Nucleic acid binder design. Structure first.
Ligand code: UTP
Ligand code: CL
Ligand code: MG
Ligand code: MG
Ligand code: MG
Ligand code: NA
Length: 327
DNA sequence: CGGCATACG
DNA sequence: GCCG
C-alpha cells in the first residue's frame, strides 16, 4: 500500500465504510480544534481503508499499512472488538463538535468564524438570525437558504442545471463549453453543490466570460445569490421542483484551454486526493502543481499538458480515472 | 525534528 | 498523528 493517496485507486464505495467513517469524525474534530496535521493523518488513515480490497476483520491486518500508528490502530481495534469507539462517540455527542459542524456547514462560515461565535456563546441557527448585524451578506444568504442547502443535490438536479448554464454560456460566448467537475464527475449520486468548468477552444476567447455568464443567468431570474473581472463564482441558483423550486449551490470556474487539464484535475478532487497529489508532486518530484499548471522551479518552465493523462505521466503516476480519485 | 495544498473572491 |  503506497503512502500517498494519488498512488492508488480509491473507489467511491468500498469495504471498510464504518471504520473510515469513524476515523473521519476524528479528522473533522481535529480540524475544528485547529490541528491540520492531525486532521490530515486521520483523513489519510481513513482513505487507506477505502483503498483496501476487502474488510479489515483483525487488528493484524493494519500491520504495515501507512498512516496507522498507535492512535488510529486503537480506534479500529475498539470498533472491531465492541462495535463502537468511545473517543469517537464522545466527540459525536459533544456540544463543541455539534455546534462547529452546524456553523461551518453554513455557506460563508468557516472554522475561524464558527469558533469565534462558539466562544461568544452562540449555539443555534436562530442565535445567528437573532443578531444579523454580525453577518456578512454571504453569511446572510447562507443562513436564509440553509435548509435547502442542507438537502442533498441529486444527479437529476445536475442535468437540468447543466442545461441552463450551457444556455447562458452559449449567448455569452458561442463555442464555449461546460464540463461537470467535482464529486459528480467522480460518480457521486449526491452532492452539496454542483461544480462546473468552462473554457473555449480558442486560447484567449475565454477572457471576460464569467461576468457575461452571470449577468445572463441573473437576467433569467435563476440567481438567488452571487458575489456581484473574475473567473470563479460561488453562487446559489434557483432550481425548479414540482410546483415550486429549491436553492442549490453552484460553482463556476473559467479557464483558458491551455490550462484546462490542470483546472479539470484540480476541480475534480477529491479534496484529499488533490492535496496528496500536490504534496507528492512537490516532495517526491520537485514540481509545483496547482489548478493552472505544473512548474519545474529549477528550469523555471511550465509543463504543457493536453489531457489529465499527460499530467499523471509527467508525475510518474499511473493514470486514475475520476471514479478512482475518491480518496 | 519539520512538514502537512492551493489560489481566487 | 504520523512519515521520513
Ligand atoms: O478545500 C478544498 C475544496 C475543494 N477543492 C477542489 O474543488 C472540488 C469541488 O469541491 P466541493 O467542495 O464542491 O467538493 P466535492 O464536489 O468533491 O463534493 P460535494 O461535497 O460537493 O459533494 C473538489 O473536488 C476539489 O477538487 C480543493 O481542492 N480544496
Ligand atoms: Cl501510480
Ligand atoms: Mg461539489
Ligand atoms: Mg463546489
Ligand atoms: Mg512534532
Ligand atoms: Na462553510
Amino acid at each position: 500500500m503506497p503512502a500517498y493517496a494519488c498512488q492508488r485507486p480509491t473507489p467511491l464505495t468500498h469495504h471498510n465504510t464504518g471504520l473510515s467513517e469513524a476515523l473521519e469524525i476524528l479528522a473533522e474534530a481535529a480540524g475544528f480544534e485547529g490541528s491540520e496535521g492531525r486532521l490530515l493523518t486521520f483523513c489519510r488513515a481513513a482513505s487507506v481503508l477505502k483503498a483496501l480490497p476487502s474488510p479489515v476483520t483483525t487488528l493484524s491486518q493494519l500491520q504495515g499499512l501507512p498512516h496507522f500508528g498507535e492512535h488510529s490502530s486503537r480506534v479500529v481495534q475498539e470498533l472491531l472488538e465492541h462495535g463502537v469507539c468511545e473517543e469517537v462517540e464522545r466527540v459525536r455527542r459533544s456540544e463543541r463538535y455539534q455546534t462547529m459542524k452546524l456553523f461551518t456547514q453554513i455557506f460563508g462560515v468557516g472554522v475561524k468564524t464558527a469558533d469565534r461565535w462558539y466562544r461568544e456563546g452562540l449555539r443555534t441557527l436562530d442565535d445567528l438570525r437573532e443578531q444579523p448585524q454580525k453577518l456578512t451578506q454571504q453569511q446572510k444568504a447562507g443562513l436564509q437558504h440553509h435548509q435547502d442547502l442542507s438537502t442533498p443535490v441529486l444527479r437529476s438536479d445536475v442535468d437540468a442545471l447543466q442545461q441552463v448554464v450551457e444556455e447562458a454560456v452559449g449567448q455569452a460566448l458561442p463555442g464555449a463549453t461546460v464540463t461537470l467537475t467535482g464529486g459528480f464527475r467522480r460518480g457521486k449520486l449526491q452532492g452539496h453543490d454542483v461544480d462546473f468548468l468552462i473554457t473555449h477552444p480558442k486560447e484567449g476567447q475565454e477572457a471576460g466570460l464569467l461576468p457575461r455568464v452571470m449577468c445572463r443567468l441573473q437576467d433569467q431570474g435563476l440567481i438567488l445569490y452571487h458575489q456581484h473581472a473574475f473567473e470563479r463564482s460561488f453562487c446559489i441558483f434557483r432550481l425548479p421542483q414540482p410546483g415550486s423550486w429549491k436553492a442549490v449551490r453552484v460553482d463556476l470556474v473559467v479557464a483558458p484551454v491551455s490550462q484546462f487539464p490542470f483546472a479539470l484535475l484540480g476541480a475534480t478532487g477529491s479534496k484529499l486526493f488533490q492535496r496528496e497529489l500536490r504534496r507528492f508532486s512537490r516532495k517526491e518530484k520537485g514540481l509545483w502543481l496547482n489548478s493552472h499548471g505544473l512548474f519545474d522551479p529549477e528550469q523555471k518552465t511550465f509543463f504543457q499538458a493536453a489531457s489529465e493523462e499527460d499530467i499523471f505521466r509527467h508525475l510518474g503516476l499511473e493514470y486514475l480515472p475520476p471514479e478512482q480519485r475518491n480518496a
